[PDB]
């Protein structure tokens, strides 16, 4: 009876040939092969960016981007309080302080007015996250950016192929980061990228250097110019990503027609409020199918999730307020207290307990499974 | 005329099948597949360790090992002054100070007496590096370790499959790290590992947690316990490593018979002193075929290297004193000066300018190419 959904990840002969091609180059790191090099140009073109830097994972893409944008001891990074922990963790790994800021009640995106107030003389970077593939308010955020002189960094891990006001992630005037971890919209099990808009070639060069043990690509005498790490992506991963990229736009198009349906079936459910839209985000990538059931405690929400999993749905609890994780308080925490932070992040505080999400693979299924999915949900929500 | 050597890396159907097997699992990260899990047990068994943690690269394996061993702001890490920059860089990325210490004149391994003197009340970790596959003096180093109470961390990136006093890397009583970067003794283009001896399960658990965004393997509600990063290895990389592991011992055995020959042809060259041995290291992995030409400046050495490359040899300049790199001085540097450091690292200071190395692939070639290789070298060294 249980509605079945398409598998994720997906692959076919493109992946197969790709892995063979990478293998048969006889050189499996980016300095001897061409898959990473080629994936970078394809990825960057696809997002209209001037440059793309493929890296080990989306967590290190944030760490490297914050580092070339000056994050470090003595700085503050503004991040939405409702996101995946990597968004703060990356700043905190650099010695910076993470200042969590509230998000919109409807889109769950970083609230522009809340950021204007957290802005401080220490603020080095403001970091919107495009929640579930729906871009954040890059117009209002860019104004704040202009007025404070605090650059923006897009955490675009959920927004492969997304668009704001007809513009691509890489055509806003900010650096952005992506993840290619197994459950993301294109994947090689692990992987990430830093994409640089027009105008940021110097930061792009510095990032290359910092991601390769600070060694020039054709240094022969071990001349390390600057500190850093190794965040290089391997040729096999790159080749699977080149095949994944090629199906992305059509997968985002199937998902957009399905969200239109499911969003409306969800909103017809008593107590259920699906993520809101925004007409300015002309292209939503649909990384997650998210909805709130306002008023639920965390325990009722988790119990509703468990019941949804028992009926065959790939449903999950949404992120937790980052300030409600122990990891957040281990290092570089703000001098406010937990309730002081929660006081001024009321939407996060409720969304942290309220919100449910379905795997984006559900948005590739046919309409009838969407119908079956929303009945399963309607029943369960009456009993939550 | 130019002697030809076997290719590196090497692969065959094992790699091919492996990549397909990984692909066909349909899940490409360690939480949904079994290649990383399986590579970890195989790798750990092969080194007699209790546990193995496969990670993105050998640089992050050092960073993660130093972090679970307490490295951080306020500590000092003792490392050989002649090594790859990652060895210090990792400590310096953690906020610690790197204290470079001299190495043996003959083996180029961390000098046990030099470390006893650099030892300080701040010293958190002493880090031998098994230069070119030849283990460092783990007996004398373990005594210093016992007397100071400063734990050892083996940087075993050059020492896959190596042995000290009949014991495997993982059977000494220390954590060790490896690299699987393209030119290493087994590779997937990129990759690394942390191996834990018997007795270190708690550090092994902490390291797992720190390498996966501080999230328990089957957390469902985003409970991040501790800070860290993402240093997870992907299933395709793991599967190529499982096939590489299986040829390692026989490749180390061919190399050992060839070094015996080449070492003696080299030592018969006027001015040429090949890396020395050590009978206590019963199994040398032979990552590099190294030799010094005492008295050469860096420029004569580099010119001799260029001439050796022009005759068809995969010859390189050896590492540079870490204290002679700009990267070293960018962060967490000691309060000594450059000449103060060089004063008390005289062997490094000369080896940094003196030493030449050939790719370990040369040690898989037949004897006749070793003979041709040593004539090419004899000629070039007379003219250096
Ligand atoms: C997945 C994710 C990341 C980090 O990516 P990894 O590839 O998993 O390290 C960063 N930010 C957001 C919002 C994410 O969802
Ligand atoms: C290669 C190397 C490393 C680091 O490894 P990557 O996989 O290249 O990051 C660490 N230490 C030594 C001595 C090495 O040679």
Tab-separated table of N, CA and C in Angstrom, chain A residues 8-12 15-16 19 23-30 56-60 63 67 84-86 89 93-94 181-182 187-190 210 213-215 220-234 236-237 240 244 298 302-303 305-306 317-320 325-328 330-331 357, chain B residues 8-12 15-16 19 23-30 56-60 63 67 84-86 89 93-94 181-182 187-190 210 213-215 220-234 236-237 240 244 298 302-303 305-306 317-320 325-328 330-331 357:
chain	number	residue	atom	x	y	z
A	8	UNK	N	17.793	7.191	-4.378
A	8	UNK	CA	18.764	8.248	-4.291
A	8	UNK	C	19.978	7.765	-3.473
A	9	UNK	N	21.194	8.028	-3.969
A	9	UNK	CA	21.420	8.640	-5.245
A	9	UNK	C	20.997	7.780	-6.454
A	10	UNK	N	21.094	8.333	-7.674
A	10	UNK	CA	20.846	7.696	-8.945
A	10	UNK	C	22.130	7.701	-9.792
A	11	UNK	N	22.231	6.714	-10.642
A	11	UNK	CA	23.360	6.688	-11.576
A	11	UNK	C	22.973	5.816	-12.768
A	12	UNK	N	23.830	5.817	-13.767
A	12	UNK	CA	23.641	4.870	-14.880
A	12	UNK	C	25.020	4.705	-15.521
A	15	UNK	N	28.048	7.317	-14.904
A	15	UNK	CA	28.831	7.109	-13.731
A	15	UNK	C	29.877	5.997	-14.017
A	16	UNK	N	29.399	4.895	-14.534
A	16	UNK	CA	30.238	3.756	-14.877
A	16	UNK	C	31.405	4.146	-15.782
A	19	UNK	N	34.034	6.554	-13.972
A	19	UNK	CA	34.903	5.938	-13.008
A	19	UNK	C	36.032	5.222	-13.751
A	23	UNK	N	39.860	6.112	-13.603
A	23	UNK	CA	40.849	5.076	-13.361
A	23	UNK	C	41.925	5.016	-14.448
A	24	UNK	N	41.544	5.023	-15.700
A	24	UNK	CA	42.435	4.788	-16.822
A	24	UNK	C	43.365	5.904	-17.222
A	25	UNK	N	43.208	7.083	-16.643
A	25	UNK	CA	44.122	8.175	-16.700
A	25	UNK	C	45.433	7.717	-16.014
A	26	UNK	N	45.390	6.766	-15.091
A	26	UNK	CA	46.565	6.268	-14.372
A	26	UNK	C	47.030	7.229	-13.279
A	27	UNK	N	46.378	8.379	-13.073
A	27	UNK	CA	46.748	9.422	-12.137
A	27	UNK	C	45.440	9.870	-11.472
A	28	UNK	N	45.364	9.785	-10.152
A	28	UNK	CA	44.068	9.852	-9.482
A	28	UNK	C	43.889	11.062	-8.623
A	29	UNK	N	44.809	12.014	-8.663
A	29	UNK	CA	44.683	13.226	-7.900
A	29	UNK	C	44.585	14.318	-8.985
A	30	UNK	N	44.092	15.498	-8.589
A	30	UNK	CA	43.883	16.592	-9.545
A	30	UNK	C	45.142	17.056	-10.253
A	56	UNK	N	37.121	18.590	-0.651
A	56	UNK	CA	36.687	17.372	-0.003
A	56	UNK	C	35.231	17.293	0.389
A	57	UNK	N	34.604	18.349	0.931
A	57	UNK	CA	33.229	18.285	1.412
A	57	UNK	C	32.725	19.726	1.637
A	58	UNK	N	31.397	19.821	1.796
A	58	UNK	CA	30.806	21.170	1.986
A	58	UNK	C	31.182	21.841	3.253
A	59	UNK	N	31.582	21.068	4.283
A	59	UNK	CA	32.062	21.635	5.540
A	59	UNK	C	33.423	22.298	5.308
A	60	UNK	N	34.305	21.639	4.553
A	60	UNK	CA	35.595	22.308	4.300
A	60	UNK	C	35.434	23.425	3.291
A	63	UNK	N	34.755	26.259	5.494
A	63	UNK	CA	35.931	26.620	6.254
A	63	UNK	C	36.909	27.376	5.362
A	67	UNK	N	37.856	31.403	5.655
A	67	UNK	CA	39.250	31.752	5.851
A	67	UNK	C	39.755	32.721	4.801
A	84	UNK	N	22.185	23.378	9.376
A	84	UNK	CA	23.017	22.228	9.689
A	84	UNK	C	24.191	22.769	10.480
A	85	UNK	N	24.702	22.053	11.513
A	85	UNK	CA	25.787	22.545	12.333
A	85	UNK	C	27.026	22.972	11.601
A	86	UNK	N	27.311	22.429	10.409
A	86	UNK	CA	28.548	22.853	9.711
A	86	UNK	C	28.662	24.342	9.489
A	89	UNK	N	29.857	25.578	12.780
A	89	UNK	CA	31.081	24.818	13.099
A	89	UNK	C	32.307	25.307	12.355
A	93	UNK	N	35.625	26.592	14.006
A	93	UNK	CA	36.908	25.901	13.808
A	93	UNK	C	38.038	26.861	13.453
A	94	UNK	N	37.697	28.067	12.971
A	94	UNK	CA	38.621	29.090	12.593
A	94	UNK	C	38.959	30.012	13.778
A	181	UNK	N	27.482	15.739	-0.591
A	181	UNK	CA	27.313	14.604	0.310
A	181	UNK	C	26.108	13.808	-0.156
A	182	UNK	N	26.113	12.490	0.036
A	182	UNK	CA	25.211	11.495	-0.458
A	182	UNK	C	23.726	11.832	-0.660
A	187	UNK	N	25.630	14.235	-6.092
A	187	UNK	CA	26.539	13.646	-5.103
A	187	UNK	C	27.566	12.663	-5.620
A	188	UNK	N	28.671	12.516	-4.859
A	188	UNK	CA	29.601	11.434	-5.097
A	188	UNK	C	29.882	10.719	-3.784
A	189	UNK	N	28.881	10.822	-2.898
A	189	UNK	CA	28.969	10.249	-1.550
A	189	UNK	C	29.536	11.298	-0.648
A	190	UNK	N	30.690	11.893	-0.978
A	190	UNK	CA	31.264	13.017	-0.349
A	190	UNK	C	31.690	14.004	-1.427
A	210	UNK	N	45.549	27.697	-0.060
A	210	UNK	CA	45.193	27.155	1.236
A	210	UNK	C	44.646	25.728	1.248
A	213	UNK	N	47.892	22.548	0.926
A	213	UNK	CA	49.058	22.647	1.805
A	213	UNK	C	49.903	23.871	1.520
A	214	UNK	N	49.280	24.924	0.995
A	214	UNK	CA	49.900	26.187	0.663
A	214	UNK	C	51.038	26.071	-0.332
A	215	UNK	N	51.012	25.079	-1.189
A	215	UNK	CA	51.993	24.843	-2.217
A	215	UNK	C	51.577	25.115	-3.643
A	220	UNK	N	58.441	22.664	-7.169
A	220	UNK	CA	59.245	21.444	-7.150
A	220	UNK	C	60.168	21.359	-5.939
A	221	UNK	N	60.289	22.425	-5.133
A	221	UNK	CA	61.316	22.441	-4.082
A	221	UNK	C	60.697	22.566	-2.707
A	222	UNK	N	59.414	22.191	-2.589
A	222	UNK	CA	58.687	22.333	-1.314
A	222	UNK	C	58.633	23.752	-0.778
A	223	UNK	N	58.262	24.743	-1.609
A	223	UNK	CA	58.073	26.109	-1.141
A	223	UNK	C	56.628	26.323	-0.689
A	224	UNK	N	56.351	26.155	0.597
A	224	UNK	CA	55.029	26.446	1.145
A	224	UNK	C	54.942	27.932	1.519
A	225	UNK	N	54.068	28.677	0.811
A	225	UNK	CA	53.934	30.116	0.961
A	225	UNK	C	53.065	30.478	2.174
A	226	UNK	N	51.957	29.752	2.282
A	226	UNK	CA	51.040	30.086	3.375
A	226	UNK	C	50.543	28.800	4.008
A	227	UNK	N	50.040	28.934	5.207
A	227	UNK	CA	49.438	27.869	5.972
A	227	UNK	C	48.091	27.453	5.342
A	228	UNK	N	47.534	26.404	5.938
A	228	UNK	CA	46.288	25.818	5.537
A	228	UNK	C	46.053	24.341	5.841
A	229	UNK	N	45.718	23.607	4.776
A	229	UNK	CA	45.364	22.214	4.918
A	229	UNK	C	45.434	21.538	3.560
A	230	UNK	N	44.865	20.338	3.487
A	230	UNK	CA	44.704	19.626	2.256
A	230	UNK	C	43.200	19.492	2.115
A	231	UNK	N	42.603	20.092	1.081
A	231	UNK	CA	41.138	19.862	0.953
A	231	UNK	C	40.885	19.455	-0.483
A	232	UNK	N	41.865	18.799	-1.138
A	232	UNK	CA	41.768	18.418	-2.546
A	232	UNK	C	40.765	17.268	-2.775
A	233	UNK	N	39.983	17.322	-3.873
A	233	UNK	CA	39.020	16.342	-4.302
A	233	UNK	C	39.791	15.433	-5.278
A	234	UNK	N	39.550	14.146	-5.264
A	234	UNK	CA	40.111	13.104	-6.076
A	234	UNK	C	39.343	12.912	-7.381
A	236	UNK	N	38.254	10.185	-8.981
A	236	UNK	CA	37.073	9.356	-9.103
A	236	UNK	C	35.832	10.168	-8.676
A	237	UNK	N	35.887	10.909	-7.573
A	237	UNK	CA	34.732	11.656	-7.080
A	237	UNK	C	34.272	12.674	-8.114
A	240	UNK	N	32.257	11.172	-11.016
A	240	UNK	CA	30.855	10.870	-10.716
A	240	UNK	C	30.038	12.169	-10.628
A	244	UNK	N	26.605	13.588	-12.524
A	244	UNK	CA	25.447	14.016	-11.718
A	244	UNK	C	24.961	15.407	-12.128
A	298	UNK	N	8.945	19.188	20.507
A	298	UNK	CA	9.885	18.283	19.852
A	298	UNK	C	9.447	16.837	19.954
A	302	UNK	N	8.794	14.435	16.879
A	302	UNK	CA	9.619	13.266	16.628
A	302	UNK	C	8.763	12.041	16.537
A	303	UNK	N	7.680	11.999	17.352
A	303	UNK	CA	6.781	10.857	17.310
A	303	UNK	C	5.974	10.835	16.002
A	305	UNK	N	7.137	12.153	13.115
A	305	UNK	CA	8.165	11.568	12.227
A	305	UNK	C	8.255	10.067	12.348
A	306	UNK	N	8.390	9.467	13.547
A	306	UNK	CA	8.533	8.003	13.596
A	306	UNK	C	7.361	7.285	12.966
A	317	UNK	N	13.072	14.742	11.195
A	317	UNK	CA	12.948	15.904	12.034
A	317	UNK	C	13.835	16.943	11.366
A	318	UNK	N	13.492	18.212	11.428
A	318	UNK	CA	14.297	19.249	10.824
A	318	UNK	C	15.443	19.573	11.794
A	319	UNK	N	16.304	20.425	11.293
A	319	UNK	CA	17.428	20.824	12.117
A	319	UNK	C	16.974	21.352	13.477
A	320	UNK	N	18.028	21.307	14.316
A	320	UNK	CA	17.768	21.836	15.673
A	320	UNK	C	18.456	23.141	15.855
A	325	UNK	N	22.579	22.707	20.694
A	325	UNK	CA	23.475	21.573	20.489
A	325	UNK	C	24.634	21.786	21.471
A	326	UNK	N	25.224	20.741	22.019
A	326	UNK	CA	26.397	20.927	22.868
A	326	UNK	C	27.606	21.364	22.079
A	327	UNK	N	27.673	20.854	20.826
A	327	UNK	CA	28.809	21.226	19.967
A	327	UNK	C	28.878	22.721	19.884
A	328	UNK	N	27.748	23.435	19.809
A	328	UNK	CA	27.851	24.900	19.611
A	328	UNK	C	28.595	25.608	20.721
A	330	UNK	N	30.873	24.255	22.830
A	330	UNK	CA	32.234	23.831	23.065
A	330	UNK	C	33.298	24.871	22.748
A	331	UNK	N	33.194	25.639	21.687
A	331	UNK	CA	34.205	26.634	21.344
A	331	UNK	C	33.555	27.863	20.712
A	357	UNK	N	10.465	17.117	7.483
A	357	UNK	CA	10.903	17.213	6.087
A	357	UNK	C	10.947	15.840	5.508
B	8	UNK	N	53.174	4.359	-11.858
B	8	UNK	CA	52.597	4.576	-10.559
B	8	UNK	C	51.597	5.746	-10.629
B	9	UNK	N	50.408	5.572	-10.036
B	9	UNK	CA	49.990	4.340	-9.435
B	9	UNK	C	49.785	3.177	-10.427
B	10	UNK	N	49.486	1.971	-9.918
B	10	UNK	CA	49.163	0.769	-10.647
B	10	UNK	C	47.739	0.309	-10.296
B	11	UNK	N	47.126	-0.354	-11.240
B	11	UNK	CA	45.809	-0.934	-10.967
B	11	UNK	C	45.573	-2.070	-11.959
B	12	UNK	N	44.493	-2.791	-11.743
B	12	UNK	CA	44.079	-3.789	-12.746
B	12	UNK	C	42.582	-4.005	-12.519
B	15	UNK	N	40.702	-2.913	-9.107
B	15	UNK	CA	40.276	-1.555	-9.028
B	15	UNK	C	38.931	-1.406	-9.791
B	16	UNK	N	38.916	-1.895	-11.004
B	16	UNK	CA	37.737	-1.854	-11.856
B	16	UNK	C	36.506	-2.448	-11.173
B	19	UNK	N	35.290	-0.301	-8.027
B	19	UNK	CA	34.611	0.931	-8.321
B	19	UNK	C	33.163	0.617	-8.698
B	23	UNK	N	29.944	1.690	-6.710
B	23	UNK	CA	28.828	2.318	-7.397
B	23	UNK	C	27.505	1.580	-7.178
B	24	UNK	N	27.486	0.281	-7.332
B	24	UNK	CA	26.273	-0.519	-7.336
B	24	UNK	C	25.607	-0.784	-6.011
B	25	UNK	N	26.243	-0.419	-4.909
B	25	UNK	CA	25.686	-0.359	-3.598
B	25	UNK	C	24.564	0.708	-3.622
B	26	UNK	N	24.618	1.694	-4.507
B	26	UNK	CA	23.620	2.762	-4.607
B	26	UNK	C	23.779	3.813	-3.509
B	27	UNK	N	24.750	3.691	-2.597
B	27	UNK	CA	24.971	4.557	-1.457
B	27	UNK	C	26.488	4.781	-1.391
B	28	UNK	N	26.925	6.030	-1.444
B	28	UNK	CA	28.328	6.310	-1.737
B	28	UNK	C	29.075	6.932	-0.603
B	29	UNK	N	28.480	7.027	0.576
B	29	UNK	CA	29.152	7.573	1.725
B	29	UNK	C	29.217	6.376	2.697
B	30	UNK	N	30.106	6.475	3.693
B	30	UNK	CA	30.312	5.371	4.639
B	30	UNK	C	29.076	4.981	5.427
B	56	UNK	N	39.680	11.775	4.885
B	56	UNK	CA	39.937	12.425	3.619
B	56	UNK	C	41.365	12.413	3.128
B	57	UNK	N	42.388	12.629	3.971
B	57	UNK	CA	43.771	12.722	3.521
B	57	UNK	C	44.691	12.623	4.756
B	58	UNK	N	45.980	12.402	4.459
B	58	UNK	CA	46.944	12.257	5.580
B	58	UNK	C	47.158	13.486	6.379
B	59	UNK	N	46.886	14.674	5.800
B	59	UNK	CA	46.973	15.934	6.531
B	59	UNK	C	45.838	16.001	7.558
B	60	UNK	N	44.628	15.601	7.161
B	60	UNK	CA	43.554	15.629	8.172
B	60	UNK	C	43.707	14.485	9.151
B	63	UNK	N	45.751	16.055	11.739
B	63	UNK	CA	44.998	17.056	12.461
B	63	UNK	C	44.044	16.378	13.438
B	67	UNK	N	44.359	16.421	17.573
B	67	UNK	CA	43.235	16.945	18.326
B	67	UNK	C	42.726	15.961	19.360
B	84	UNK	N	57.626	16.694	5.418
B	84	UNK	CA	56.644	17.360	4.579
B	84	UNK	C	55.951	18.368	5.473
B	85	UNK	N	55.593	19.581	4.981
B	85	UNK	CA	54.976	20.598	5.804
B	85	UNK	C	53.741	20.184	6.549
B	86	UNK	N	52.981	19.191	6.070
B	86	UNK	CA	51.756	18.809	6.814
B	86	UNK	C	51.991	18.445	8.260
B	89	UNK	N	52.208	21.760	9.920
B	89	UNK	CA	50.975	22.490	9.569
B	89	UNK	C	49.765	22.054	10.370
B	93	UNK	N	47.564	24.375	12.641
B	93	UNK	CA	46.144	24.619	12.354
B	93	UNK	C	45.265	24.470	13.591
B	94	UNK	N	45.763	23.770	14.623
B	94	UNK	CA	45.083	23.535	15.858
B	94	UNK	C	45.375	24.645	16.884
B	181	UNK	N	47.748	9.560	-0.687
B	181	UNK	CA	47.860	10.513	-1.785
B	181	UNK	C	48.609	9.839	-2.919
B	182	UNK	N	48.303	10.185	-4.169
B	182	UNK	CA	48.712	9.590	-5.404
B	182	UNK	C	50.104	8.952	-5.530
B	187	UNK	N	47.407	3.990	-2.882
B	187	UNK	CA	46.707	5.254	-3.137
B	187	UNK	C	45.346	5.160	-3.790
B	188	UNK	N	44.520	6.205	-3.575
B	188	UNK	CA	43.303	6.364	-4.341
B	188	UNK	C	43.240	7.782	-4.890
B	189	UNK	N	44.446	8.342	-5.054
B	189	UNK	CA	44.609	9.723	-5.524
B	189	UNK	C	44.642	10.610	-4.320
B	190	UNK	N	43.650	10.536	-3.423
B	190	UNK	CA	43.616	11.154	-2.156
B	190	UNK	C	43.175	10.120	-1.129
B	210	UNK	N	34.615	13.514	16.094
B	210	UNK	CA	35.177	14.720	15.521
B	210	UNK	C	35.294	14.759	13.997
B	213	UNK	N	31.361	15.724	11.910
B	213	UNK	CA	30.581	16.869	12.384
B	213	UNK	C	30.055	16.676	13.792
B	214	UNK	N	30.757	15.876	14.592
B	214	UNK	CA	30.435	15.573	15.968
B	214	UNK	C	29.067	14.947	16.156
B	215	UNK	N	28.567	14.244	15.168
B	215	UNK	CA	27.301	13.559	15.195
B	215	UNK	C	27.334	12.052	15.276
B	220	UNK	N	19.338	10.854	14.833
B	220	UNK	CA	18.276	11.240	13.907
B	220	UNK	C	17.766	12.658	14.145
B	221	UNK	N	18.183	13.330	15.230
B	221	UNK	CA	17.559	14.610	15.590
B	221	UNK	C	18.566	15.738	15.578
B	222	UNK	N	19.674	15.548	14.845
B	222	UNK	CA	20.755	16.550	14.815
B	222	UNK	C	21.349	16.872	16.174
B	223	UNK	N	21.713	15.857	16.978
B	223	UNK	CA	22.396	16.085	18.243
B	223	UNK	C	23.911	16.097	18.037
B	224	UNK	N	24.500	17.269	17.844
B	224	UNK	CA	25.952	17.397	17.752
B	224	UNK	C	26.547	17.548	19.159
B	225	UNK	N	27.339	16.543	19.584
B	225	UNK	CA	27.898	16.473	20.924
B	225	UNK	C	29.152	17.350	21.058
B	226	UNK	N	30.001	17.240	20.042
B	226	UNK	CA	31.254	17.993	20.131
B	226	UNK	C	31.547	18.620	18.780
B	227	UNK	N	32.399	19.611	18.805
B	227	UNK	CA	32.886	20.308	17.640
B	227	UNK	C	33.820	19.391	16.821
B	228	UNK	N	34.222	19.937	15.678
B	228	UNK	CA	35.084	19.287	14.733
B	228	UNK	C	34.988	19.695	13.266
B	229	UNK	N	34.779	18.678	12.426
B	229	UNK	CA	34.767	18.888	10.997
B	229	UNK	C	34.117	17.694	10.320
B	230	UNK	N	34.289	17.616	9.004
B	230	UNK	CA	33.879	16.485	8.229
B	230	UNK	C	35.178	15.958	7.651
B	231	UNK	N	35.582	14.735	8.008
B	231	UNK	CA	36.823	14.243	7.350
B	231	UNK	C	36.519	12.853	6.830
B	232	UNK	N	35.249	12.575	6.470
B	232	UNK	CA	34.817	11.252	6.023
B	232	UNK	C	35.355	10.901	4.621
B	233	UNK	N	35.761	9.635	4.398
B	233	UNK	CA	36.249	9.083	3.162
B	233	UNK	C	35.007	8.473	2.485
B	234	UNK	N	34.882	8.578	1.186
B	234	UNK	CA	33.844	8.084	0.326
B	234	UNK	C	34.109	6.654	-0.135
B	236	UNK	N	33.890	5.165	-3.121
B	236	UNK	CA	34.710	4.829	-4.267
B	236	UNK	C	36.194	4.799	-3.842
B	237	UNK	N	36.672	5.776	-3.077
B	237	UNK	CA	38.078	5.840	-2.687
B	237	UNK	C	38.471	4.603	-1.891
B	240	UNK	N	39.048	1.470	-4.032
B	240	UNK	CA	40.339	1.412	-4.724
B	240	UNK	C	41.466	1.115	-3.723
B	244	UNK	N	44.434	-1.804	-3.457
B	244	UNK	CA	45.850	-1.402	-3.360
B	244	UNK	C	46.552	-2.096	-2.192
B	298	UNK	N	71.904	24.230	-2.071
B	298	UNK	CA	70.603	23.972	-2.682
B	298	UNK	C	70.641	24.127	-4.188
B	302	UNK	N	69.675	21.309	-6.792
B	302	UNK	CA	68.528	21.438	-7.673
B	302	UNK	C	68.951	21.268	-9.099
B	303	UNK	N	70.172	21.757	-9.429
B	303	UNK	CA	70.672	21.612	-10.786
B	303	UNK	C	71.018	20.147	-11.096
B	305	UNK	N	69.458	17.546	-9.604
B	305	UNK	CA	68.094	17.050	-9.893
B	305	UNK	C	67.640	17.374	-11.294
B	306	UNK	N	67.708	18.629	-11.781
B	306	UNK	CA	67.192	18.895	-13.133
B	306	UNK	C	67.884	18.063	-14.190
B	317	UNK	N	64.160	17.011	-5.451
B	317	UNK	CA	64.837	17.635	-4.346
B	317	UNK	C	64.110	17.111	-3.118
B	318	UNK	N	64.787	16.921	-2.005
B	318	UNK	CA	64.153	16.437	-0.801
B	318	UNK	C	63.479	17.634	-0.116
B	319	UNK	N	62.775	17.286	0.933
B	319	UNK	CA	62.098	18.329	1.678
B	319	UNK	C	63.060	19.440	2.100
B	320	UNK	N	62.331	20.532	2.401
B	320	UNK	CA	63.115	21.692	2.881
B	320	UNK	C	62.894	21.892	4.337
B	325	UNK	N	60.433	27.686	5.329
B	325	UNK	CA	59.243	27.873	4.504
B	325	UNK	C	58.530	29.099	5.088
B	326	UNK	N	57.868	29.911	4.286
B	326	UNK	CA	57.096	31.018	4.843
B	326	UNK	C	55.874	30.539	5.589
B	327	UNK	N	55.304	29.425	5.073
B	327	UNK	CA	54.110	28.868	5.732
B	327	UNK	C	54.429	28.625	7.176
B	328	UNK	N	55.636	28.158	7.520
B	328	UNK	CA	55.882	27.817	8.940
B	328	UNK	C	55.721	28.992	9.880
B	330	UNK	N	53.892	31.790	9.343
B	330	UNK	CA	52.600	32.437	9.351
B	330	UNK	C	51.814	32.296	10.646
B	331	UNK	N	51.805	31.161	11.308
B	331	UNK	CA	51.048	30.987	12.543
B	331	UNK	C	51.790	30.056	13.499
B	357	UNK	N	66.094	12.467	-4.098
B	357	UNK	CA	65.306	11.243	-3.930
B	357	UNK	C	64.720	10.870	-5.250
